[PDB]
Amino acid sequence: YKIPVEADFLFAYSTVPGYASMRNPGRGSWFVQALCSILEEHGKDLEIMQILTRVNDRVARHFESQSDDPHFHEKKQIPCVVSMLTKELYFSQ
Amino acid sequence: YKIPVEADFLFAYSTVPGYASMRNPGRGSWFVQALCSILEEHGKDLEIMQILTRVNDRVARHFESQSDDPHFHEKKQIPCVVSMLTKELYFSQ
Amino acid sequence: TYQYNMNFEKLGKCIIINNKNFDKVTGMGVRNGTDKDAEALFKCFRSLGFDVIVYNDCSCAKMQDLLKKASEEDHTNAACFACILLSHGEENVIYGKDGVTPIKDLTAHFRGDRCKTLLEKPKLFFIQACRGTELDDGIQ
Amino acid sequence: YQYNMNFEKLGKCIIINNKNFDKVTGMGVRNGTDKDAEALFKCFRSLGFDVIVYNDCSCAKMQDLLKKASEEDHTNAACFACILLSHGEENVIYGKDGVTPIKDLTAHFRGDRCKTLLEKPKLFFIQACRGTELDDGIQ
Amino acid sequence: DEVX
Amino acid sequence: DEVX
Numbered sequence: 001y002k003i004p005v006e007a008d009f010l011f012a013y014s015t016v017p018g019y020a021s022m023r024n025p026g027r028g029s030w031f032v033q034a035l036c037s038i039l040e041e042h043g044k045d046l047e048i049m050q051i052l053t054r055v056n057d058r059v060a061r062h063f064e065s066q067s068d069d070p071h072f073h074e075k076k077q078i079p080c081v082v083s084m085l086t087k088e089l090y091f092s093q
Numbered sequence: 094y095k096i097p098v099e100a101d102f103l104f105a106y107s108t109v110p111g112y113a114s115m116r117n118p119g120r121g122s123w124f125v126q127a128l129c130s131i132l133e134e135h136g137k138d139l140e141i142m143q144i145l146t147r148v149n150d151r152v153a154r155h156f157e158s159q160s161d162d163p164h165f166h167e168k169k170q171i172p173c174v175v176s177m178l179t180k181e182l183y184f185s186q
Numbered sequence: 187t188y189q190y191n192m193n194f195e196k197l198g199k200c201i202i203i204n205n206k207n208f209d210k211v212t213g214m215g216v217r218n219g220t221d222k223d224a225e226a227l228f229k230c231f232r233s234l235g236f237d238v239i240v241y242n243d244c245s246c247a248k249m250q251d252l253l254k255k256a257s258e259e260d261h262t263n264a265a266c267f268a269c270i271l272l273s274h275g276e277e278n279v280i281y282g283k284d285g286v287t288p289i290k291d292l293t294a295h296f297r298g299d300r301c302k303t304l305l306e307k308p309k310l311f312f313i314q315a316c317r318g319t320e321l322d323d324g325i326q
Numbered sequence: 327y328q329y330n331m332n333f334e335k336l337g338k339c340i341i342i343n344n345k346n347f348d349k350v351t352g353m354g355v356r357n358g359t360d361k362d363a364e365a366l367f368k369c370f371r372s373l374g375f376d377v378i379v380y381n382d383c384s385c386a387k388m389q390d391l392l393k394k395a396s397e398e399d400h401t402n403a404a405c406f407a408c409i410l411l412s413h414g415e416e417n418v419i420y421g422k423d424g425v426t427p428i429k430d431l432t433a434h435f436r437g438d439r440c441k442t443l444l445e446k447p448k449l450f451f452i453q454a455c456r457g458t459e460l461d462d463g464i465q
Numbered sequence: 466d467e468v469x
Numbered sequence: 470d471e472v473x
Contacts, residue, residue, distance in 0.1 A: 004171035008307060009296075009472050050144075083173075088143065103447060160467040316473040
């Protein structure tokens with residue numbers, strides 16, 4: 001009858017451990033841009049992992065950093081989903 | 094055109110960070126038991142996150158530790174899925 | 187029996203922490219662009235059906251207390267809970283204006299034994315923040 | 327929206343089954359892990375993986391196993407899978423001789439370090455402790 | 466019930 | 470672009 005106290009958590013990190021996260025001063029951070037765009041288009045009809053997987057893809061493909069500083073130039077990013085969910089999650093019906 | 098070096102990884106941990114993982118000497122570890130049972134029934138027809146989510150549920154509900162040592166008695170467990178995948182994953186077709 | 191039960195009076199609370207400015211002593215600069223993030227997140231999650239609240243330039247104590255109180259509220263009629271963090275960060279920790287606080291401590295308030303009204307309900311945390319200094323050069 | 331699965335092989339599946347441990351590590355026998363390993367072997371074999379089980383591996387061996395695997399040619403493989411069964415602590419897994427970081431094992435398959443698994447899923451299943459805390463549960 |  |  002008991003349920004683990006750590007169960008039913010989900011963490012959608014913008015990036016993987018040890019790595020930085022990119023933010024565009026004019027457009028906002030990459031992860032949020034992608035998250036919102038996909039949610040606007042599929043928030044109601046897709047399962048949460050499907051959404052975040054597509055978010056992963058969007059950040060990974062559509063984005064590449066630009067900077068006069070070469071250290072931060074042409075860099076890439078992949079987000080990081082941590083799921084302790086026990087069920088599928090749909091935001092509708 | 095470029096792809097992040099950390100992309101397309103998936104980690105299916107038996108438990109969450111900081112926590113132990115339960116193993117039954119006669120029946121095997123909880124996580125593996127659940128994983129195999131779910132894979133046996135749905136490995137070919139379900140997406141990997143659907144599979145691991147059901148594994149999460151099975152470990153969280155069907156299992157509770159038994160032990161003479163009270164420190165390890167009636168304890169619970171929730172696994173931990175870390176996804177850097179960019180697509181849905183089916184083991185068929 | 188494979189999906190979370192979404193048949194509740196409300197979908198749930200969505201807390202957005204929008205940290206833009208930081209005390210100089212932290213060594214953290216302004217996070218330009220975070221305002222457009224906070225807005226887009228607001229419009230999106232409001233549209234989903236969440237009761238959205240936006241907090242700005244919070245201290246570590248503010249962030250901790252904020253989430254603590256949220257976990258002490260009654261979520262019986264809520265389907266789920268969501269929290270979005272927008273700030274500077276390092277591995278396992280998030281920046282308030284005042285400094286760093288562990289992410290685990292923020293989320294621990296919503297553990298099953300510490301927030302019984304969100305038991306068996308999904309607890310979502312979206313985190314826009316650095317987790318270290320490494321960069322991904324990419325390939326091909 | 328799905329990974330391309332139209333390849334000659336599903337991929338390689340490495341199972342590391344650590345049961346007994348060098349006394350200097352202070353870690354005891356992991357009874358039941360053999361039943362795990364066999365059950366896992368049949369499951370992943372049924373999926374279509376080319377499964378090989380390695381037993382009681384040292385840290386150097388585990389590193390070598392995965393390094394060699396990442397250096398193989400996965401051009402005709404849809405994906406790669408690795409299953410780790412051993413004692414562990416946070417961020418580390420036990421070899422017979424002691425501990426090795428999980429990050430080091432998996433880093434071999436990074437996009438820039440394994441070009442034939444680029445844009446292909448790399449799966450790691452890990453049965454091991456990640457600390458000493460226990461979950462008392464509730465209700 | 467042992468732990469890993 | 471900047472980093473967080």
